[PDB]
PDB file of C-alpha atoms and ligand atoms in Angstrom:
ATOM      1  CA  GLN A   1     -24.145  78.545  27.044  1.00 57.84           C
ATOM      2  CA  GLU A   2     -27.231  76.773  28.456  1.00 56.08           C
ATOM      3  CA  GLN A   3     -28.993  74.578  25.903  1.00 55.09           C
ATOM      4  CA  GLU A   4     -32.729  74.078  26.249  1.00 51.92           C
ATOM      5  CA  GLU A   5     -32.331  70.280  26.236  1.00 51.85           C
ATOM      6  CA  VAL A   6     -29.338  68.401  27.605  1.00 51.76           C
ATOM      7  CA  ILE A   7     -28.655  64.654  27.529  1.00 56.31           C
ATOM      8  CA  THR A   8     -25.648  63.501  29.497  1.00 55.70           C
ATOM      9  CA  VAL A   9     -24.381  59.908  29.229  1.00 57.32           C
ATOM     10  CA  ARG A  10     -21.624  58.024  30.989  1.00 58.75           C
ATOM     11  CA  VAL A  11     -20.402  54.502  30.341  1.00 59.79           C
ATOM     12  CA  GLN A  12     -18.504  53.372  33.408  1.00 60.24           C
ATOM     13  CA  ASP A  13     -17.603  50.643  35.910  1.00 62.41           C
ATOM     14  CA  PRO A  14     -16.900  47.614  33.632  1.00 62.73           C
ATOM     15  CA  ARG A  15     -17.380  44.375  35.571  1.00 61.23           C
ATOM     16  CA  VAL A  16     -16.761  40.729  34.853  1.00 55.05           C
ATOM     17  CA  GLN A  17     -19.907  38.684  35.388  1.00 53.04           C
ATOM     18  CA  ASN A  18     -19.694  34.924  36.101  1.00 51.67           C
ATOM     19  CA  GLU A  19     -15.935  35.195  36.299  1.00 51.22           C
ATOM     20  CA  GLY A  20     -13.986  32.054  35.446  1.00 50.65           C
ATOM     21  CA  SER A  21     -16.965  30.278  33.872  1.00 49.39           C
ATOM     22  CA  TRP A  22     -18.131  29.499  30.347  1.00 53.40           C
ATOM     23  CA  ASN A  23     -20.701  32.306  30.579  1.00 58.05           C
ATOM     24  CA  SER A  24     -18.229  34.968  31.745  1.00 57.63           C
ATOM     25  CA  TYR A  25     -18.604  38.396  30.073  1.00 56.91           C
ATOM     26  CA  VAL A  26     -17.909  42.099  30.756  1.00 57.35           C
ATOM     27  CA  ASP A  27     -20.748  44.518  31.169  1.00 56.98           C
ATOM     28  CA  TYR A  28     -20.728  48.281  31.419  1.00 58.40           C
ATOM     29  CA  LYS A  29     -22.816  50.672  33.611  1.00 57.28           C
ATOM     30  CA  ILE A  30     -24.687  53.244  31.491  1.00 57.75           C
ATOM     31  CA  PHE A  31     -25.780  56.349  33.420  1.00 56.39           C
ATOM     32  CA  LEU A  32     -27.974  58.949  31.796  1.00 58.51           C
ATOM     33  CA  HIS A  33     -29.390  62.336  33.025  1.00 60.42           C
ATOM     34  CA  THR A  34     -31.615  64.431  30.840  1.00 57.34           C
ATOM     35  CA  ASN A  35     -34.405  66.950  30.513  1.00 56.42           C
ATOM     36  CA  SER A  36     -35.110  65.917  26.945  1.00 54.03           C
ATOM     37  CA  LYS A  37     -38.765  65.482  26.050  1.00 50.95           C
ATOM     38  CA  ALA A  38     -37.680  62.438  24.024  1.00 50.74           C
ATOM     39  CA  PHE A  39     -36.962  60.538  27.229  1.00 50.68           C
ATOM     40  CA  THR A  40     -39.324  59.061  29.765  1.00 50.21           C
ATOM     41  CA  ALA A  41     -37.018  58.986  32.817  1.00 49.06           C
ATOM     42  CA  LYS A  42     -34.872  61.902  33.940  1.00 49.11           C
ATOM     43  CA  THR A  43     -32.115  59.573  35.192  1.00 50.17           C
ATOM     44  CA  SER A  44     -31.328  55.956  34.473  1.00 50.10           C
ATOM     45  CA  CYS A  45     -28.696  53.425  35.337  1.00 47.22           C
ATOM     46  CA  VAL A  46     -28.464  50.117  33.489  1.00 47.93           C
ATOM     47  CA  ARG A  47     -25.825  47.542  32.541  1.00 48.01           C
ATOM     48  CA  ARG A  48     -25.184  46.375  28.958  1.00 47.90           C
ATOM     49  CA  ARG A  49     -22.558  44.150  27.354  1.00 48.80           C
ATOM     50  CA  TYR A  50     -20.783  44.768  24.060  1.00 47.99           C
ATOM     51  CA  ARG A  51     -22.863  42.323  22.004  1.00 50.87           C
ATOM     52  CA  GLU A  52     -25.948  44.298  23.051  1.00 51.30           C
ATOM     53  CA  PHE A  53     -24.398  47.504  21.620  1.00 53.80           C
ATOM     54  CA  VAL A  54     -23.739  45.565  18.420  1.00 54.53           C
ATOM     55  CA  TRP A  55     -27.389  44.602  18.292  1.00 54.15           C
ATOM     56  CA  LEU A  56     -28.411  48.202  19.039  1.00 53.92           C
ATOM     57  CA  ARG A  57     -26.367  49.698  16.216  1.00 53.38           C
ATOM     58  CA  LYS A  58     -27.874  47.235  13.701  1.00 53.04           C
ATOM     59  CA  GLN A  59     -31.373  48.041  14.896  1.00 51.63           C
ATOM     60  CA  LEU A  60     -30.828  51.780  14.767  1.00 53.54           C
ATOM     61  CA  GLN A  61     -29.604  51.429  11.162  1.00 54.79           C
ATOM     62  CA  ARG A  62     -32.716  49.483  10.260  1.00 52.37           C
ATOM     63  CA  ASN A  63     -34.969  52.475  11.058  1.00 47.42           C
ATOM     64  CA  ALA A  64     -32.672  55.466  10.592  1.00 48.29           C
ATOM     65  CA  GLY A  65     -33.151  56.032   6.818  1.00 47.80           C
ATOM     66  CA  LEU A  66     -30.350  58.281   5.561  1.00 45.40           C
ATOM     67  CA  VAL A  67     -29.292  59.474   9.061  1.00 43.47           C
ATOM     68  CA  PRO A  68     -25.860  57.895   9.472  1.00 44.53           C
ATOM     69  CA  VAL A  69     -25.428  55.736  12.516  1.00 43.56           C
ATOM     70  CA  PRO A  70     -22.192  56.164  14.561  1.00 40.72           C
ATOM     71  CA  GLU A  71     -19.768  53.305  14.396  1.00 41.51           C
ATOM     72  CA  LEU A  72     -18.782  51.184  17.390  1.00 39.02           C
ATOM     73  CA  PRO A  73     -15.257  50.484  18.651  1.00 42.00           C
ATOM     74  CA  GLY A  74     -14.066  47.139  17.153  1.00 36.68           C
ATOM     75  CA  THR A  75      -6.212  43.916  16.568  1.00 39.08           C
ATOM     76  CA  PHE A  76      -5.401  44.955  20.159  1.00 38.47           C
ATOM     77  CA  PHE A  77      -2.009  44.295  21.734  1.00 39.40           C
ATOM     78  CA  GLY A  78      -2.359  45.505  25.343  1.00 36.08           C
ATOM     79  CA  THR A  79      -3.690  43.909  28.509  1.00 32.92           C
ATOM     80  CA  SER A  80      -7.339  42.911  28.990  1.00 31.65           C
ATOM     81  CA  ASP A  81      -7.880  45.897  31.374  1.00 36.78           C
ATOM     82  CA  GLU A  82      -6.421  48.211  28.708  1.00 38.98           C
ATOM     83  CA  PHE A  83      -8.656  46.654  26.027  1.00 38.83           C
ATOM     84  CA  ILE A  84     -11.726  47.120  28.284  1.00 36.77           C
ATOM     85  CA  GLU A  85     -10.840  50.733  28.963  1.00 36.91           C
ATOM     86  CA  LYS A  86     -10.438  51.546  25.256  1.00 38.60           C
ATOM     87  CA  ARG A  87     -13.739  49.797  24.570  1.00 40.80           C
ATOM     88  CA  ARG A  88     -15.428  51.725  27.377  1.00 38.70           C
ATOM     89  CA  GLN A  89     -14.214  54.971  25.832  1.00 39.05           C
ATOM     90  CA  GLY A  90     -15.498  53.964  22.431  1.00 40.57           C
ATOM     91  CA  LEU A  91     -18.928  52.971  23.810  1.00 36.72           C
ATOM     92  CA  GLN A  92     -19.198  56.311  25.600  1.00 40.69           C
ATOM     93  CA  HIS A  93     -18.386  58.110  22.341  1.00 38.35           C
ATOM     94  CA  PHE A  94     -20.837  56.012  20.391  1.00 41.70           C
ATOM     95  CA  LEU A  95     -23.707  56.873  22.704  1.00 43.86           C
ATOM     96  CA  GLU A  96     -22.774  60.605  22.764  1.00 46.15           C
ATOM     97  CA  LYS A  97     -23.028  60.704  18.995  1.00 46.01           C
ATOM     98  CA  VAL A  98     -26.221  58.707  18.841  1.00 49.30           C
ATOM     99  CA  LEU A  99     -27.842  61.062  21.353  1.00 50.38           C
ATOM    100  CA  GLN A 100     -27.168  64.055  18.994  1.00 52.54           C
ATOM    101  CA  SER A 101     -29.682  62.812  16.480  1.00 53.32           C
ATOM    102  CA  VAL A 102     -33.387  63.604  16.766  1.00 52.25           C
ATOM    103  CA  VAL A 103     -34.071  60.723  14.395  1.00 53.42           C
ATOM    104  CA  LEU A 104     -32.108  58.174  16.474  1.00 56.65           C
ATOM    105  CA  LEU A 105     -33.760  59.558  19.605  1.00 57.58           C
ATOM    106  CA  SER A 106     -37.162  58.621  18.170  1.00 56.34           C
ATOM    107  CA  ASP A 107     -36.245  54.892  18.201  1.00 57.73           C
ATOM    108  CA  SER A 108     -37.894  53.099  21.120  1.00 56.92           C
ATOM    109  CA  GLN A 109     -35.310  50.319  20.995  1.00 55.22           C
ATOM    110  CA  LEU A 110     -32.755  52.902  22.110  1.00 54.30           C
ATOM    111  CA  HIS A 111     -34.877  53.999  24.996  1.00 53.23           C
ATOM    112  CA  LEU A 112     -35.420  50.499  26.257  1.00 53.78           C
ATOM    113  CA  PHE A 113     -31.664  49.728  25.867  1.00 51.12           C
ATOM    114  CA  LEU A 114     -30.743  52.810  27.946  1.00 48.40           C
ATOM    115  CA  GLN A 115     -33.643  53.058  30.435  1.00 49.03           C
ATOM    116  CA  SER A 116     -34.714  49.530  31.149  1.00 50.83           C
ATOM    117  CA  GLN A 117     -32.990  46.286  31.914  1.00 55.10           C
ATOM    118  CA  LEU A 118     -35.064  44.303  29.454  1.00 56.08           C
ATOM    119  CA  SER A 119     -33.090  41.659  27.531  1.00 58.51           C
ATOM    120  CA  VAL A 120     -32.635  42.078  23.816  1.00 55.97           C
ATOM    121  CA  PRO A 121     -35.355  39.519  23.063  1.00 52.68           C
ATOM    122  CA  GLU A 122     -37.649  41.317  25.541  1.00 52.32           C
ATOM    123  CA  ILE A 123     -36.966  44.685  23.878  1.00 54.92           C
ATOM    124  CA  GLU A 124     -37.764  43.252  20.452  1.00 57.31           C
ATOM    125  CA  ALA A 125     -41.035  41.797  21.758  1.00 53.27           C
ATOM    126  CA  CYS A 126     -41.957  45.001  23.521  1.00 55.34           C
ATOM    127  CA  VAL A 127     -41.530  47.224  20.503  1.00 53.07           C
ATOM    128  CA  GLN A 128     -43.333  44.647  18.290  1.00 51.99           C
ATOM    129  CA  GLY A 129     -46.329  44.843  20.642  1.00 53.10           C
ATOM    130  CA  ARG A 130     -46.040  41.276  21.933  1.00 53.68           C
ATOM    131  CA  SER A 131     -45.210  42.121  25.577  1.00 51.82           C
ATOM    132  CA  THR A 132     -47.731  42.694  28.350  1.00 50.47           C
ATOM    133  CA  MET A 133     -46.551  46.317  28.809  1.00 46.95           C
ATOM    134  CA  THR A 134     -45.924  49.334  26.724  1.00 46.32           C
ATOM    135  CA  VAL A 135     -42.485  50.821  26.089  1.00 46.15           C
ATOM    136  CA  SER A 136     -43.426  53.634  28.566  1.00 45.36           C
ATOM    137  CA  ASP A 137     -44.510  51.249  31.253  1.00 42.53           C
ATOM    138  CA  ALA A 138     -41.331  49.151  30.935  1.00 43.27           C
ATOM    139  CA  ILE A 139     -39.282  52.337  31.436  1.00 43.14           C
ATOM    140  CA  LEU A 140     -41.443  53.653  34.253  1.00 46.92           C
ATOM    141  CA  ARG A 141     -41.470  50.399  36.112  1.00 47.25           C
ATOM    142  CA  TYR A 142     -37.700  50.250  35.958  1.00 50.75           C
ATOM    143  CA  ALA A 143     -37.470  53.858  37.154  1.00 49.47           C
ATOM    144  CA  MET A 144     -39.816  53.311  40.072  1.00 48.04           C
ATOM    145  CA  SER A 145     -37.975  50.124  41.078  1.00 45.28           C
ATOM    146  CA  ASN A 146     -34.643  50.706  42.816  1.00 45.87           C
ATOM    147  CA  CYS A 147     -32.681  48.374  40.487  1.00 42.00           C
ATOM    148  CA  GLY A 148     -30.342  50.885  38.783  1.00 38.71           C
TER     149      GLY A 148
HETATM  150 CL1   CL B 201     -22.341  58.905  37.224  1.00 37.51          CL
HETATM  151 CL1   CL B 202     -39.289  57.334  25.290  1.00 35.12          CL
HETATM  152 CL1   CL B 203     -18.810  56.802  13.488  1.00 35.76          CL
HETATM  153 NA1   NA B 204     -14.752  41.697  26.865  1.00 36.37          NA
HETATM  154 NA1   NA B 205     -43.363  66.405  27.052  1.00 31.79          NA
HETATM  155 NA1   NA B 206     -40.987  45.494  32.657  1.00 33.64          NA
HETATM  156 NA1   NA B 207     -44.325  50.833  38.861  1.00 33.94          NA
END
């Protein structure tokens, strides 16, 4: 009934950023609560857009060996709100599956995606050792800030 380690994830609250402009896009709130020793922060709240998930999947596959990486949601014939809701569902399912794998949970790019608001280029730099702070400090600083 009660597992030793639980990781709960929710993708929620899609929002249009820069609405009406060239740089308009939808992002998604990602909430996480866990007691997993793989994680630095017990709770986190970040926002990520679809192209960032696309990046994340590719990166996970790079390091995953033979552990299969879950597929993302991808024509669509409904309204934009209906498309966004289907996508939101698919992103939630993607992350649930990813979080079942001890191998995928060992990837620091995942942790910075979920528990920091570093940009993709920042995450890449951080895990390549080119940033001024460690993966842990990026995640702790975000936690201790009130940004989520
Ligand atoms: Cl929530
Ligand atoms: Cl971590
Ligand atoms: Cl899949
Ligand atoms: Na969109
Ligand atoms: Na520990
Ligand atoms: Na930081
Ligand atoms: Na701090």
